[PDB]
């Protein structure tokens, strides 16, 4: 599923990432913006034989299983393609560990890159919230 901008904003509102840790929703929605560009089935692969699945791009080397990540952990207790779902409930449960672990959100590097220390309200402007 390729999530709208607000409809993603109300999804992640409903699930509790609003103001999570410290992050104001419009820092998730311009993370999965620029993550996976709204995209449920996004999947990246990673020079060390990870891979990033999912609307924000959660890695197999320490959060999911996808049976090729040899040395890998599974701290969120589920299968990477559970991470593909059109129902990003799987996703912001994890993200929320993610998050929890200490490096806040500069664990996502698009996020560091390209929405921290900006305008991240923006993304949320005009949504019905
Ligand atoms: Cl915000
Ligand atoms: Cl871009
Ligand atoms: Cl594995
Ligand atoms: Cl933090
Ligand atoms: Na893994």
């Known amino acids: 599923k390729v ?23 419009g820092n998730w929605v311009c993370a999965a913006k620029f993550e996976s560009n709204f995209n449920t089935q996004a999947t990246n692969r990673n020079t060390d ?53 200490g490096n806040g959100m500069n664990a996502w590097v698009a996020w560091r890159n390209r929405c921290k220390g900006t305008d991240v309200q923006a993304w949320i402007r005009g949504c019905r919230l």
Not at 3 to 25: I, Q
Not at 61 to 76: E, F, K, Y
């Open 3 to 25: 999530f709208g901008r607000c409809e993603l904003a109300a999804a992640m509102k409903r699930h509790g990432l609003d103001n999570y840790r410290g992050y104001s929703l």
């Open 49 to 101: 034989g990870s891979t990033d699945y999912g609307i924000l791009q959660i890695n197999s080397r320490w959060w999911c299983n996808d049976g090729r990540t040899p040395g890998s952990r599974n701290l969120c207790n589920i299968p990477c393609s559970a991470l593909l779902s059109s129902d990003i409930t799987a996703s912001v449960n994890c993200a929320k560990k993610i998050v929890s672990d």
